[PDB]
Amino acid sequence: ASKELELITLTVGFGILIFSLIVTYCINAKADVLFIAPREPGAVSY
């Protein structure tokens, strides 16, 4: 059952990263607006 447990643990880790990203992303945009600074679509390069 260790496998199932390992998978669940990894699932949470990935979820945490997603939220963290959405948090830093929202802040990054706020700054770009706070001072009419360069802005790109979804900050996606290329």
Backbone as a printed PyTorch tensor [residue, N CA C, xyz], in Angstrom:
tensor([[[  0.8610,  -1.2160,   0.0000],
         [  0.0000,   0.0000,   0.0000],
         [  0.8810,   1.2440,   0.0000]],

        [[  2.1840,   1.0420,   0.1750],
         [  3.1250,   2.1550,   0.1880],
         [  3.0400,   2.9450,  -1.1150]],

        [[  2.8060,   2.2370,  -2.2140],
         [  2.7030,   2.8820,  -3.5190],
         [  1.5590,   3.8920,  -3.5290]],

        [[  0.3770,   3.4420,  -3.1180],
         [ -0.7910,   4.3160,  -3.0880],
         [ -0.5250,   5.5370,  -2.2150]],

        [[  0.1400,   5.3190,  -1.0860],
         [  0.4540,   6.4110,  -0.1720],
         [  1.4210,   7.3930,  -0.8220]],

        [[  2.4420,   6.8600,  -1.4830],
         [  3.4310,   7.7000,  -2.1470],
         [  2.7650,   8.5690,  -3.2100]],

        [[  1.8430,   7.9740,  -3.9610],
         [  1.1400,   8.7030,  -5.0110],
         [  0.3310,   9.8520,  -4.4170]],

        [[ -0.3740,   9.5710,  -3.3270],
         [ -1.1860,  10.5900,  -2.6720],
         [ -0.3140,  11.7440,  -2.1910]],

        [[  0.8200,  11.4100,  -1.5860],
         [  1.7350,  12.4290,  -1.0840],
         [  2.2170,  13.3220,  -2.2220]],

        [[  2.5510,  12.7060,  -3.3520],
         [  3.0240,  13.4560,  -4.5090],
         [  1.9180,  14.3580,  -5.0510]],

        [[  0.6840,  13.8660,  -5.0010],
         [ -0.4550,  14.6360,  -5.4920],
         [ -0.5800,  15.9510,  -4.7290]],

        [[ -0.4050,  15.8860,  -3.4120],
         [ -0.5010,  17.0800,  -2.5800],
         [  0.6330,  18.0500,  -2.9000]],

        [[  1.8360,  17.5100,  -3.0600],
         [  2.9980,  18.3370,  -3.3740],
         [  2.7650,  19.1380,  -4.6500]],

        [[  2.2620,  18.4650,  -5.6810],
         [  1.9940,  19.1270,  -6.9530],
         [  0.9290,  20.2040,  -6.7860]],

        [[ -0.0770,  19.9130,  -5.9700],
         [ -1.1550,  20.8660,  -5.7330],
         [ -0.6330,  22.1230,  -5.0440]],

        [[  0.2760,  21.9350,  -4.0920],
         [  0.8500,  23.0600,  -3.3630],
         [  1.6160,  23.9740,  -4.3150]],

        [[  2.3820,  23.3730,  -5.2180],
         [  3.1550,  24.1440,  -6.1830],
         [  2.2300,  24.9960,  -7.0480]],

        [[  1.1210,  24.4010,  -7.4820],
         [  0.1630,  25.1180,  -8.3210],
         [ -0.3180,  26.3840,  -7.6190]],

        [[ -0.8120,  26.2250,  -6.3970],
         [ -1.3030,  27.3660,  -5.6290],
         [ -0.2060,  28.4150,  -5.4680]],

        [[  0.9730,  27.9710,  -5.0470],
         [  2.0970,  28.8800,  -4.8570],
         [  2.3530,  29.6850,  -6.1270]],

        [[  2.3090,  29.0080,  -7.2690],
         [  2.5380,  29.6710,  -8.5420],
         [  1.4700,  30.7290,  -8.7940]],

        [[  0.2100,  30.3420,  -8.6300],
         [ -0.8980,  31.2630,  -8.8540],
         [ -0.7940,  32.4680,  -7.9250]],

        [[ -0.1570,  32.2680,  -6.7770],
         [  0.0080,  33.3430,  -5.8070],
         [  1.0690,  34.3310,  -6.2760]],

        [[  2.2300,  33.8070,  -6.6580],
         [  3.3180,  34.6530,  -7.1300],
         [  2.9530,  35.2930,  -8.4650]],

        [[  2.1750,  34.5730,  -9.2690],
         [  1.7590,  35.0840, -10.5710],
         [  0.8610,  36.3060, -10.4010]],

        [[ -0.1110,  36.1980,  -9.4980],
         [ -1.0340,  37.2990,  -9.2480],
         [ -0.2770,  38.5260,  -8.7520]],

        [[  0.7200,  38.2960,  -7.9020],
         [  1.5180,  39.3900,  -7.3610],
         [  2.3680,  40.0230,  -8.4580]],

        [[  2.9580,  39.1850,  -9.3030],
         [  3.7960,  39.6730, -10.3900],
         [  3.0130,  40.6440, -11.2700]],

        [[  1.7550,  40.3080, -11.5400],
         [  0.9090,  41.1600, -12.3710],
         [  0.5920,  42.4670, -11.6500]],

        [[  0.2760,  42.3650, -10.3650],
         [ -0.0470,  43.5460,  -9.5730],
         [  1.0670,  44.5820,  -9.6750]],

        [[  2.3040,  44.1250,  -9.5370],
         [  3.4520,  45.0200,  -9.6180],
         [  3.5500,  45.6490, -11.0050]],

        [[  3.3540,  44.8280, -12.0330],
         [  3.4250,  45.3080, -13.4070],
         [  2.4200,  46.4290, -13.6390]],

        [[  1.3200,  46.3890, -12.9000],
         [  0.2860,  47.4070, -13.0330],
         [  0.5610,  48.5870, -12.1050]],

        [[  0.9510,  48.2790, -10.8730],
         [  1.2390,  49.3170,  -9.8900],
         [  2.0960,  50.4130, -10.5020]],

        [[  3.0030,  50.0150, -11.3800],
         [  3.8630,  50.9890, -12.0530],
         [  3.9530,  50.6850, -13.5350]],

        [[  2.8700,  50.9690, -14.2630],
         [  2.8240,  50.7350, -15.7090],
         [  4.1220,  50.1150, -16.2040]],

        [[  4.3330,  48.8510, -15.8460],
         [  5.5560,  48.1520, -16.2290],
         [  5.2480,  47.0940, -17.2840]],

        [[  6.2480,  46.6480, -17.9930],
         [  6.0920,  45.6190, -19.0550],
         [  5.1250,  44.5110, -18.6460]],

        [[  4.2430,  44.1320, -19.5650],
         [  3.2660,  43.0860, -19.2890],
         [  3.1600,  42.1270, -20.4710]],

        [[  3.1670,  40.8290, -20.1770],
         [  3.0680,  39.8220, -21.2230],
         [  1.9230,  38.8550, -20.9300]],

        [[  1.4310,  38.1930, -21.9420],
         [  0.3100,  37.2170, -21.7990],
         [  0.7010,  36.0080, -20.9520]],

        [[  0.0140,  35.8320, -19.8270],
         [  0.3020,  34.7160, -18.9360],
         [  1.7950,  34.6240, -18.6460]],

        [[  2.5010,  35.7370, -18.8380],
         [  3.9380,  35.7700, -18.5930],
         [  4.6230,  34.5850, -19.2700]],

        [[  3.9800,  34.0460, -20.3010],
         [  4.5370,  32.9100, -21.0270],
         [  5.5720,  33.3800, -22.0440]],

        [[  6.8060,  32.9080, -21.8870],
         [  7.8780,  33.2870, -22.7990],
         [  7.6370,  32.6960, -24.1860]],

        [[  8.0320,  33.4350, -25.2170],
         [  7.8520,  32.9740, -26.5880],
         [  6.3880,  32.6410, -26.8510]]])
